[PDB]
Amino acid sequence: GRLRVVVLGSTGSIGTQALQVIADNPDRFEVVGLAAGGAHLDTLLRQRAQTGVTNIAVADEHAAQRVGDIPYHGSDAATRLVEQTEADVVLNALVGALGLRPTLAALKTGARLALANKESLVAGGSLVLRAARPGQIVPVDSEHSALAQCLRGGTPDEVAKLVLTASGGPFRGWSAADLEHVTPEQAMGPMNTLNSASLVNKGLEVIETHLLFGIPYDRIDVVVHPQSIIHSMVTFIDGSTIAQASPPDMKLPISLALGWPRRVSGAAAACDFHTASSWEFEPLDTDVFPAVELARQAGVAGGCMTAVYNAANEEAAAAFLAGRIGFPAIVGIIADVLHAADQWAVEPATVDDVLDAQRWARERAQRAVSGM
Amino acid sequence: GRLRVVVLGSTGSIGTQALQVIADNPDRFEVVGLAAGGAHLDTLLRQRAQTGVTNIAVADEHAAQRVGDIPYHGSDAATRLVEQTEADVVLNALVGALGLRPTLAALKTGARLALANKESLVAGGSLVLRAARPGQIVPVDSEHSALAQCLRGGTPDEVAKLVLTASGGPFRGWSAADLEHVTPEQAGAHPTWSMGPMNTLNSASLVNKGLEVIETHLLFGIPYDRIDVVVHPQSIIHSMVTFIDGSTIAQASPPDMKLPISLALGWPRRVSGAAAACDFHTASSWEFEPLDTDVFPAVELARQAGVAGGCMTAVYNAANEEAAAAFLAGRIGFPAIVGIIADVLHAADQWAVEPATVDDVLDAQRWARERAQRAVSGM
Numbered sequence: 235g236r237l238r239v240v241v242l243g244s245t246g247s248i249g250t251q252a253l254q255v256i257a258d259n260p261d262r263f264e265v266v267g268l269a270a271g272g273a274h275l276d277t278l279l280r281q282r283a284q285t286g287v288t289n290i291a292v293a294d295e296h297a298a299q300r301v302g303d304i305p306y307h308g309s310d311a312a313t314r315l316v317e318q319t320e321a322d323v324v325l326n327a328l329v330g331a332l333g334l335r336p337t338l339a340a341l342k343t344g345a346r347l348a349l350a351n352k353e354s355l356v357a358g359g360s361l362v363l364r365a366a367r368p369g370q371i372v373p374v375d376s377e378h379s380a381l382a383q384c385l386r387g388g389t390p391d392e393v394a395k396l397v398l399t400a401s402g403g404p405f406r407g408w409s410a411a412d413l414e415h416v417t418p419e420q421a422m423g424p425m426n427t428l429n430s431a432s433l434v435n436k437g438l439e440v441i442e443t444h445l446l447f448g449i450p451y452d453r454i455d456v457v458v459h460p461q462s463i464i465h466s467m468v469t470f471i472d473g474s475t476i477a478q479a480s481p482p483d484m485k486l487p488i489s490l491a492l493g494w495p496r497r498v499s500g501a502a503a504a505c506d507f508h509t510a511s512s513w514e515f516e517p518l519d520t521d522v523f524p525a526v527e528l529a530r531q532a533g534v535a536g537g538c539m540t541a542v543y544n545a546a547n548e549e550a551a552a553a554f555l556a557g558r559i560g561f562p563a564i565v566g567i568i569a570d571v572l573h574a575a576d577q578w579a580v581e582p583a584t585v586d587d588v589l590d591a592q593r594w595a596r597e598r599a600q601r602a603v604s605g606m
Numbered sequence: 607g608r609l610r611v612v613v614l615g616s617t618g619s620i621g622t623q624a625l626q627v628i629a630d631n632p633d634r635f636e637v638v639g640l641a642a643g644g645a646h647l648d649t650l651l652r653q654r655a656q657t658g659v660t661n662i663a664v665a666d667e668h669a670a671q672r673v674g675d676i677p678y679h680g681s682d683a684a685t686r687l688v689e690q691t692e693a694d695v696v697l698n699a700l701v702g703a704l705g706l707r708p709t710l711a712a713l714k715t716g717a718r719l720a721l722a723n724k725e726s727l728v729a730g731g732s733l734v735l736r737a738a739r740p741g742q743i744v745p746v747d748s749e750h751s752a753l754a755q756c757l758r759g760g761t762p763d764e765v766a767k768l769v770l771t772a773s774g775g776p777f778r779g780w781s782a783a784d785l786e787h788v789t790p791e792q793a794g795a796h797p798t799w800s801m802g803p804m805n806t807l808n809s810a811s812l813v814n815k816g817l818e819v820i821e822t823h824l825l826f827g828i829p830y831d832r833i834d835v836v837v838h839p840q841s842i843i844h845s846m847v848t849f850i851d852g853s854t855i856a857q858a859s860p861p862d863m864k865l866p867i868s869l870a871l872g873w874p875r876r877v878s879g880a881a882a883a884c885d886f887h888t889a890s891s892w893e894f895e896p897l898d899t900d901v902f903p904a905v906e907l908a909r910q911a912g913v914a915g916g917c918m919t920a921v922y923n924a925a926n927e928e929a930a931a932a933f934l935a936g937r938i939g940f941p942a943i944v945g946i947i948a949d950v951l952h953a954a955d956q957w958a959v960e961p962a963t964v965d966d967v968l969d970a971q972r973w974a975r976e977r978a979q980r981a982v983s984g985m
């Protein structure tokens with residue numbers, strides 16, 4: 235009785251690592267579907283050959299044509315694959331807010347959603363939550379996987395605080411003036427790396443924490459931990475903190491999300507306490523790095539505001555990577571877009587509501603770029 | 607609901623802190639019995655006056671002579687109190703040998719045993735385990751309390767390693783040559799108001815950690831080859847569990863025994879506001895380093911004793927007590943403490959037999975003490 239797994243974004247870092255965990259664990263997992271964008275066809279063809287899975291979605295029509303025998307092709311390909319494939323688990327490792335429809339489709343099938351695409355939850359907000367049963371979304375994000383594990387340390391009424399760790403990025407300790415000169419070269423993928431550096435990733439993760447676990451924003455702490463060995467912690471009402479620790483390796487949270495609640499033997503190397511190490515903690519410099527506070531503000535506003543936060547980032551980040559704006563302008567644009575986003579506090583009733591909010595935010599972010 | 611608590615060893619560090627937790631949480635706990643040895647009779651009488659608990663026991667019959675209205679007095683006073691008192695939880699914070707019989711009596715009543723007394727497991731071993739039912743014993747000490755919490759991170763089948771943290775003591779990082787020079791004062795022989803010199807000394811020699819490793823094996827049923835020790839000077843991480851997938855779950859808090867005491871009393875329910883939580887507003891670091899087992903072999907020796915089983919861990923502990931006594935008195939050097947334990951253990955194979963009675967345990971200790979005395983004197 236193997237779990238049938240659909241892997242969305244199969245050719246990316248998380249996707250390939252997931253396929254490796256599945257290949258190492260044939261008694262527990264079986265691949266039944268693959269989805270890819272179409273930029274890494276070499277990898278996709280190998281994946282088809284090795285897994286024997288022809289049930290494949292390709293987003294780019296030209297790429298799907300170039301390949302051949304692809305049953306699902308076009309922008310809605312991944313969504314239709316999910317809708318029409320019998321599965322126990324959908325791993326959503328697509329990139330960006332475009333993971334939204336496949337996330338909704340997955341939840342509506344009743345399968346466990348192993349979520350790597352944090353953007354679909356951040357953007358979807360209550361719309362995504364209303365489609366899910368309790369515990370149906372299982373995080374692949376390292377911090378949230380850690381939180382889920384640490385929450386086993388007590389009952390829900392015993393939780394005082396959730397403590398999200400953050401690497402601090404390559405610019406930890408830098409001044410506001412220092413960040414002016416940051417180049418795209420200095421800052422997994424281009425977006426994952428950049429969002430880490432700008433602290434917008436951590437803002438997205440704070441929102442993700444609130445939505446997954448239902449804890450109020452004022453009880454979600456962020457601490458900088460440069461070693462990235464402690465992946466997050468939960469503080470309980472008696473003063474006890476339970477923390478999860480492991481050498482960085484996404485195969486650990488991937489494996490746990492795929493097989494929840496059961497741990498997968500040998501998924502990753504454990505901390506080695508026969509060698510010296512230091513786990514350091516320091517407060518986030520919120521003045522220099524206000525992305526987390528902006529996320530909290532968007533989160534408290536709720537409705538479609540978190541979709542706005544993410545959409546504004548996607549556009550500003552693209553502008554930065556293209557050499558059009560400076561590094562500090564990323565969070566500057568997000569703030570400008572949010573201040574103008576009055577009407578988006580309304581709760582999304584349909585996917586179209588979220589899409590409307592994102593459309594508006596993308597336009598407004600472009601407006602903000604044009605004024606620079 | 608309100609748990610009825612018997613506090614054995616009410617005048618010690620653990621007992622008094624427990625009473626503070628109980629005083630601060632009257633909706634959760636009520637004291638229904640108090641027992642003490644007698645050396646601190648005045649404290650016990652004040653506790654009777656303060657709590658209104660008249661159900662009290664004094665072990666020292668000679669000390670009991672000073673009061674006309676103690677219901678339980680004499681050698682087995684604490685045991686008799688436990689046997690005759692309706693309670694939900696028995697906190698056993700008695701010191702040494704006087705803790706073993708009360709542990710067995712507590713287990714027989716069907717009450718939860720919040721266990722601080724080390725003798726009960728280290729010496730009692732299979733006697734205590736055979737009398738206990740799953741989950742009946744809840745550990746009071748910080749490392750074991752941490753382990754119990756971290757074990758919530760998976761099923762028993764998912765456990766790979768139990769990892770105990772150790773402070774490293776005052777001689778953390780010292781060479782073998784350095785340790786030759788250690789004086790009792792350096793090893794922490796100061797006449798502290800609450801504790802004797804054995805606690806600090808056992809920390810310094812790593813014998814305390816050895817004892818904790820033995821207790822870990824007995825409490826949690828993990829083999830010795832899967833119980834690790836790491837030195838962590840800050841004592842913020844109190845212990846950890848590594849699971850089969852590579853995940854480690856750790857318990858962290860500023861040092862404060864009220865946390866593990868509160869949890870042992872209220873298990874499985876946490877006690878709101880028991881202790882302060884880790885505060886990350888100021889930069890800090892948690893450091894880990896391996897123990898040099900060549901310089902500090904006490905833990906390895908404990909594993910040897912534990913694997914041998916039977917009364918061998920009783921022998922380990924009793925040899926330590928005698929050797930540690932010789933060191934504090936200036937009869938041997940610091941490095942000779944573990945040397946003597948080793949020498950006694952290697953001659954002790956007759957004690958690998960499982961104890962049938964308390965007297966079997968006491969006989970093993972007697973033999974070990976005498977053997978250690980011979981080693982010290984050279985006779």
Ligand SMILES: [Mn+2]
Nearest residue numbers: 375376377439
């Ligand atoms: Mn993350």
Ligand SMILES: [Mn+2]
Nearest residue numbers: 747748749818
């Ligand atoms: Mn301890």
